[PDB]
Structure formats: structure tokens, C-alpha cells
Structure 1
């Protein structure tokens, strides 16, 4: 009774042919878990073949196969046997049973001693860019990612071996974490994930009332709510923030309606793990640790929309004081730059821009040190550092009396004035208007420059070499300058009689003109194509994200004075939580209710 015959009969599902298996094992003193009866390619056992070869929902060979191993005296168990391949490590027959959507087999294995906590941690099951299927790593998590209610309840409340919702995989993800990761933003997928999320959470209140499943942190330290913010999955993120239940499952809610009067609703939103007072909160994750394109849409949800608005109103005076101090610093910078060679005020002005340059240098170095873990949202943070570095360098150069201090001082003055766009986000008038520059405008300007500069060099070398023979363009720098004048509309296109190849030089200049026009039209077309496929509502949400990032930075205070963080909301009994009262008026939704 070799492997080939054994693998064939379990595939055909004929228990009558399996009679000689037990006698052969006893005669040879072997077990079904031995390497002889396992495929060396992956490590598949005889039981794994049976479960994936099903007829009428139940393979009749499984039960005789399992009882033979018990009679064989195997120190291990065929039911708990796992694959050993790198890609499919930890895969078991129990995983196959749930995948095949056959509750009857899942009932069969656990009755014979199936370990419900088997961990399939192979490279195929790990989440990565490639051929993979991440569902967590436990049969309970597998039964949850697949919409299989009948399996998932039985695994949790069976008398043989009940599964635990607090079980974690190799990454520390529980069942709730696994549902978040497999949750797409599609509204067919998100509906089932949310419904699965609530059902498992509600049933967790029966099996483990003393365990809070929502506060279990994985190896990254993220709760299921924090993980949704980091993964950028707004559809499940919105539901958890605004979760509300009634009846015995009321304590599982995070939104508590206080009173409703017509279109006006007053709800108490829980700020646990949401308020920025605690480190690694949801608000900090969205602004800094999140990298999905949806992070601007998640800062406009409730209570985040009102929580950040109240923080902005408290810190709006600090924002303008910071703006006022920058205007004063730049006013001193401009006056000193202009009146550069009465000397006492210039010396005092030089000191202030020296002290100011150090202040911005230390402030930005402290910022990047805190941002070192996750780093275009920091566009102005880089510029504010460069302006400080050049100002410090320029003042250092002035001490050494080198003439190159003036160019660095002037470049700092140019950069400093350009840094004033950072404070446009503090006003709704200028904040929304300045949204559509960094996203599309600034990016595509770089695209034209790199392509154009390469062939500007190619033509510049061509013109100089061709113009070296007489019957202009004395160097690359000169020839580059004359060629660039065509772009600014000042190009001198003339039939130069001083050159022997006067005719050919004109042809090169002409060929450069239309070829450059190809580049401008391509850039204009590139600019044009995103305007048509654009949403104006994104400008308001992106601006709120810019204010959301700003208020979180001012909450830390200055580098020289770390202020104490103030916790929002108040401790209110709902079981008492730090809730946040939100007043919402919605005539459209109220009228549809009538």
C-alpha cells in the first residue's frame, strides 16, 4: 500500500478500498504523517487530498482515514499535520475545509481533534505584492474573510474545541484586524466586511465579555480602528468611528445619540484612541503614518471633522502669531538685503536674521527628527529648512568676509518670500485656491524641464560646433542662453552672415523651435487632461488635511518649549468614556425619514 495507491483512493472517495491500509501500516510500523506518504513538493498529507476532493459535500473516505491513524498509534495527528513548503507553510486540512465552503467536513475534523488554532504562515498567505491570499493565518480568520456565517459561529462555540477571537497570527493580527486588511473600498465588499465586523464583535460579547476585542494591538501597536486609518480604508474606518448599537450590545457602540429633535441630532462620539492627546492616535496616523490617497477624505468624517475644527479654533491665534513672526523676520531680511553695503542697525539686522536662521534651523531639524520614521506633504518643511541653512551659511560667510555671502543671502531672501505660501492654508479664501498647485501644477513643470534641458544641451553643443567656422554661440552657456530665449519669446532667429554654414545653422534653430513647441503642447495637454477628470470637492478636503497636519504640529508646541497636551472632550458615563459631543443638522436626511 504505497503513496500512489493511497493518494488515488482518497481522491476517488471509496472507503471500501481503504481496508488494507491499516494492515500495511501495522506491518511496516509506519504512520500517515511519515514523509513517505507526503508529497515532497509542498508537504501535502493524505487527509489534505480528501478534503479538496469532495462529492455531495462529504467525502466518505475521511472518517475511515482518520480512525486508521488513531489505530496506528501516531504520536502526531494527521488532522493537525501542516505543509512544510516555504510558500504554503502551515497549510492544513482544516483550512481547505473552510475554503471549500463545506461545513460538514469542518464539523468532521474538529470532532476527531482538529486544532482550530493552526497557523498557515507560508509566503503564499503572507500579504505582499504578488501572488498571495492574505486572510489572517487562522481557520477562524479564514472563515471570517470568506462570508461563511455557519462556519464561523460553529468554530467559536463548538464544545470540542472553541476558537478564540483574541487569537493572533504571525503579525499579531486578530480576526478583526484581518477583516480590515481584506476590506476594499468597493461598496459590495465593504458591506460584507462591516456586517462580519459587527457580528463577530457582538458575538464576542457573549464568549469573552471580559476581553475588549477592539483594543487588541498587533505587533505594529495598531488597534483595528488605528489599522483602518493607516491602511487608508475609509469605508470600514467610518463605520467604527460612528458605530452605534441598541439593546444588550449598546456598550459596543462608539456613537451615543444624546437627543434628536427634527433635523438636529446630538451624538456623543468616543474619543478613545482617536484624540491626539495620546501618542500614536488615529489623528496622528492619518496625517503622518498613512500614505494612501484617501487620507484627505478621512479627516472630514465625524467626529474628526469637528474634533479638528475645535482644535483649529483654539490654535488659530497661534497660527497667525507664527505668521506674524515670520513676516517680521522677513521684513528685517528684506531691509537688510536691500541696505547691504546706519551700520549699527544693519549689524542688529544681521544678528536678528542670524538668530532667526538658527531658530528655523533648529525647529526644522527637530521636526525632521520626529518625522524620520515616515517621510510632497513635507514640501514646505524642506524649503523652510533650506532657507534656514542658507541664512546660517550666509551669515557664517559674512563673518569670514568672503564675497559669496551676498549670493547666499539673496537666495535666502528669495526662498523666504516663497515660503509664505505655507500660511495661505490658514484662510479659507487662500487655502482652497492654493490646493491645486502641489498636486498637479508643480509635478508636471518638472517633467518638461528635465526633457527640455537634455535637448537644450544637445542643440547648444551642435550650434557652437557648427558656428565655429566663419564665412555668436561661443560656448554651451551662451548657446544654451540663446536657445532658451525662444521659449520666453525673445529668441533672435536671424540669418547670420558671419557663419560659413549660415544656412544650416538656421535650419537647426528652426528645428529646435517646432521641436520645443512639441514639448510645450505635450505639457499643456498633460496639464489639460487632469482638469477635465478632477473633482472640486477634493480641494476642500485636501485643504482640511493641510489644516489637520498643521494643528497636530502646533499641539506639540515649539522646540524650545514643549507644551502640555490638552485632552478634548469630557469624561461622561455612557461605563464612562471621554466622549465628544457633536451637533449635526441634516434637513435632507430628516425629510427622507418623514
Structure 2
């Protein structure tokens, strides 16, 4: 149904300015409840996702005349701050309609600037840009969260060089010395907006945001992340890396010198080595518990779904899994079992492997490790199916071809054919067996199909994939550093506010009211002509 589709709505929709003017002059109302099921969101089905307000239609259709006309109605003035069923205003509508293209970006940027300045001039006391929708998002936060990179890029650095309008600007150029220009960015609600800052929503997205990788490349955010890196996060991160390395060393030493008797636990003696060993064990288990609770805290503060859990946040999953293995080892240690060694070694191997987590923060090593992670996930799921089909087929063929009253098992034959991958195949591992010619034909066919053709194809395809991820690796590394910075500043372990940029600097000194304004401006020096 098309509930609320009044004549004014249709006149605007059809781009008939004459009808719009006549209906408005005749007293047609603006606050139309265009709440029909057609006019709701979910554009996948037939519908109109940016309705529920004729101002939203007037702005979204790129017609300046209509929106400029509704500023001063003859009968009933329009209100820009009018909210639809989900709290969205005209600005939220302008954000939502974007598709991240150059022409659409131009149109949406133009309309956004014009509508915002007109609303400010009509109502200087009302800060339209700060109004939140039902989800608690400003249009800036909505653009950042939803994936509208173009509008975000505009908003973060818009400026107006006019009197009584510059106080609405984000970017300023207050000082210049010949070719040198000292730009300022207010950057409110980027470091913190008390609920959801721009960095928080970009970094901790659900992984469905198409541009979560590209948003952090913009002018102010990249410099902010670099500044926070250089300020205090670099030291804390390297310190954590050092502590983790010491933890792994202690764990390895504890594991290597474990006792060799049966049926734990094992009691301390009057010697000295046992005290070092049990100290190492206690420190290891303490580390395991710490990572256990870190994993839980990560989960609870995010609650991602299956479609987001196993496609993102691999490092937290791996550290948590390490913790699980160590705790199972503890349980078995006290449960009078030998099998604690198995879980302990799996934990140890995973801990040393997870040492690669810290390559983030180092440029070249981090890019390298990201490429490895992506070329594991993309390649094993494609390769191992093909390889295992070949291996299993020829293993069953050979093992069922040979039999006597030693290689009568599918396990051993699977192993002997696996060896051909690592350059230790024999080509003769049985003798006097029936159908020698068939056996040789099968092995040679296996070797040609797998060793000579398949592995070389793996190398070639990995080459292609490498060629196609030079840039995605850089973006992902920057994102990983962003996650590290945000987590470190969010916790910080001291309950201190070190995330501030420059203090309450007197950026503007003017508002519509006769007052000054301090806006936490961050300075950037550039040189140009």
C-alpha cells in the first residue's frame, strides 16, 4: 500500500514544479505520514527506502527550488528536524541515498551543504547536524557505519569561507606564511562521542560495510591514528609484545622440563629445579586464564553473528582457542591422566604460531603476515579438496590392487603417496605383487597429476593472487593498526584520558549567539605555492 501518498508527494516525485508550487500555496501540509509499506526501507523488495517525509523527497531528488521554497510557507512552515518512523531527518535521508559514485557524490554533497546552511540560517539556535536517529547515529556516524565513504569524505573536511557561516565549518585555514598553510580540523565525535565515535563504528563494523578498509585512508583519520600510534600506543604495544614473548618462553621451558612419571599430579621435593618448574607452570596457567577472560570480554562487548564471527576477528578466536587447550590440559593434569600432554603441546604450538599476531605495528612484517593469512584462507579451501580427491582416489586404487595373506592398510598407502609431495616418494615400495604394470601406471599417473602439475599450478595461482592483493594488504594492515589503537586507548589499564588531541583551542571564537567556541582543533601543516 501507498499510505500517505498525498498530492504534494506525487507532484514532487514527478518533478512537476508547477503542481508543487500550487499545492503548497493552496495550503498542502508538509508533515505527511508517508508510512506505507511500499514507502518503507528494505529496497530489495519493491519499495521506496527514503520516504516518510516530503522534505526527504525534495532533498533526495536534487531539486533546490522545492527545499528553498518550503523555508517560508504561506500557511504552514516546513521543519527540517522532522523525523520519520526511525528518527531519520533530511540529512539522514541524504546520507542513505548515496551510492559512492562521483556524480552522486557531487549531487548529495551539494544538496547536503545547501540544506544544512539554509537550516542554520533559518534556525541558528538549532544544530541540525547533531540530531540522532533511533539508532543513536548522527548523519556523520550513519555515513561512516553504513559504508557511504563519499559523504563521509565530504563531511569530515567541509569548510565555508563566509562571515557567520565559518562557525559551521570543520576545516579551517587560520594561518599562512607564504606557501605554508596551517589547517585545523575540529574532529569532534571522532575520538569520542560518548556512545559511538567515527573510528569506533568504522573499525568495529560487522564486516558487511563495503568500505571499512577504505574509510581510514581519508585525510584526518589517518593522521589521527598515526598521532596516537606515535604518542603512547607504540610503547604499550611493544611492551605487550615483549611480555607475551617472555610468557611464551616461560611456557616452553615449563613444557620441555615436564616430569616423565605416570599419573599426575607430582609433588615438590627439597631440590631447587622443581620450584622453578612449578613457578613456570603457574605463570603459564595464569596467562592462559588471562587470555580466556580476554576472549570472553571481546565476545560480550561485540556479540557478532556466525556470518561475522568466522570471517573476522581471527586473532581473538585463536588466542581464545589457545586458552581452551591450556585449561583442558589443567583439567587433565589434576584428573590423573597422561593426555594433558596432548592439549599442552597443542596450546604451545598455537602460542608460538600466534606470535605472528604482533607483526602488526611493523610495516613490512605486518603486510607480509596479512598476505600469509589471506593466502591461507583463500588457497587451502580451493587446493586441499582437489589434492585430497587425487590422493584418496589413487590411495584406494593402489591399496585395493595389492593384497596378501604391511601396506594392506589404507593409512599406510595414503602416507606413502603423500610422501610424493615432499620429495620422498619411492616409485617402488612393494615387490612380487600382482599386476606390476598396473601398479606402476597408477603411481606414474599419480605423480604426474599431483607432483608435476598440481603443485606447480598452486605456485602459479598463488602468484596471481599475490599480484591482486598488493593494495588490500595495505588497507587491512592499516585497519589492524586501527583496531590495536582503539582497543589500547579504550582499556589503557589506568582509567586515564590520554586520547585528547590538542586541548580546548579557540578555533572559531564565534557562534550565532554572542559567545566564543573551543572545538579541540587538530593542526596539520601543508605547503603549496
> Same fold judged by TM-score > 0.5?
yes
Paired with 1:172 and 1:327, the residues of 2 have a C-alpha distance of: 50
Which residue among 244, 252, 265 is the counterpart of 1:334?
A: 252
Paired with 1:451 and 1:295, the residues of 2 have a C-alpha distance of: 33
Aligned to 2:333: 398
Aligned to 1:308: 225
Aligned to 2:53: 138
SS at match of 2:523: strand
Which residue among 366, 369, 375 is the counterpart of 1:434?
A: 369
Paired with 1:502 and 1:172, the residues of 2 have a C-alpha distance of: 79
SS at match of 2:504: strand
Paired with 2:461 and 2:48, the residues of 1 have a C-alpha distance of: 37
Paired with 1:228 and 1:329, the residues of 2 have a C-alpha distance of: 42
- Give the alignment of 1:207-286 within 5 angstroms: 207-247=122-162, 248-276=164-192, 278-286=194-202
Paired with 1:445 and 1:262, the residues of 2 have a C-alpha distance of: 57
**How far did residue 430 of structure 1 move?**
2.1
**How far did residue 353 of structure 1 move?**
0.6
**How far did residue 483 of structure 1 move?**
2.7
What's the Cα RMSD here?
A: 2.5
Aligned to 2:100: 185
Paired with 2:34 and 2:388, the residues of 1 have a C-alpha distance of: 54
**How far did residue 523 of structure 1 move?**
4.0
Which residue among 161, 176, 188 is the counterpart of 2:91?
A: 176
SS at match of 1:296: coil
Paired with 1:459 and 1:89, the residues of 2 have a C-alpha distance of: 67
User: For 1:328-363, what per-residue CA distance to the aligned partner results, in whole angstroms no more than 9, with x for missing partners?
Assistant: 100111112222232222111111111111111112
Q: Does 1:476 align with 2:403?
A: no
Q: Is the 8 A contact 1:483 1:491 kept in 2?
A: yes
Q: Is the 8 A contact 1:171 1:218 kept in 2?
A: yes
Aligned to 1:95: 9
Paired with 1:511 and 1:117, the residues of 2 have a C-alpha distance of: 77
Aligned to 1:344: 275
Q: Is the 8 A contact 1:259 1:267 kept in 2?
A: yes
Larger radius of gyration: 1
**Kindly tell me: are residues 510 and 239 of structure 1, through their superposed partners in 2, closer, same or farther at Cα, counting changes over 3 Å?**
same
Aligned to 1:288: 204
**How far did residue 224 of structure 1 move?**
0.5
**How far did residue 217 of structure 1 move?**
0.8
Paired with 1:439 and 1:157, the residues of 2 have a C-alpha distance of: 57
* TM-score normalised by length of structure 2: 0.87
Paired with 1:433 and 1:410, the residues of 2 have a C-alpha distance of: 27
SS at match of 2:520: strand
Q: Is the 8 A contact 2:143 2:149 kept in 1?
A: yes
Aligned to 2:72: 157
Aligned to 2:433: 499
Paired with 1:439 and 1:323, the residues of 2 have a C-alpha distance of: 23
**How far did residue 290 of structure 1 move?**
5.7
Paired with 2:295 and 2:42, the residues of 1 have a C-alpha distance of: 36
Paired with 2:158 and 2:419, the residues of 1 have a C-alpha distance of: 62
Aligned to 2:495: 563
For CA contacts below 8 A with separation 6 or more, give which structure has more relative contact order: 2
User: For 1:9-61, what per-residue CA distance to the aligned partner results, in whole angstroms no more than 9, with x for missing partners?
Assistant: xxxxxxxxxxxxxxxxxxxxxxxxxxxxxxxxxxxxxxxxxxxxxxxxxxxxx
**Kindly tell me: are residues 357 and 290 of structure 1, through their superposed partners in 2, closer, same or farther at Cα, counting changes over 3 Å?**
closer
Name the stretch that deviates more: 540-549 or 175-184: 540-549
Paired with 1:101 and 1:515, the residues of 2 have a C-alpha distance of: 65
Q: Is the 8 A contact 1:424 1:434 kept in 2?
A: yes
Paired with 2:443 and 2:37, the residues of 1 have a C-alpha distance of: 59
Paired with 2:461 and 2:75, the residues of 1 have a C-alpha distance of: 64
**How far did residue 304 of structure 1 move?**
1.5
Paired with 2:88 and 2:455, the residues of 1 have a C-alpha distance of: 51
Name the stretch that deviates more: 204-213 or 416-425: 204-213
**How far did residue 534 of structure 1 move?**
4.6
SS at match of 2:391: helix
Aligned residues: 498
**How far did residue 263 of structure 1 move?**
3.9
* TM-score normalised by length of structure 1: 0.78
Q: Does 1:456 align with 2:415?
A: no
Q: Is the 8 A contact 2:175 2:181 kept in 1?
A: yes
Q: Is the 8 A contact 1:180 1:224 kept in 2?
A: yes
Aligned to 2:522: 581
Name the stretch that deviates more: 287-296 or 235-244: 287-296
Name the stretch that deviates more: 133-142 or 561-570: 561-570
**Kindly tell me: are residues 567 and 550 of structure 1, through their superposed partners in 2, closer, same or farther at Cα, counting changes over 3 Å?**
closer
Paired with 1:310 and 1:427, the residues of 2 have a C-alpha distance of: 16
Q: Is the 8 A contact 1:244 1:256 kept in 2?
A: yes
**How far did residue 300 of structure 1 move?**
2.9
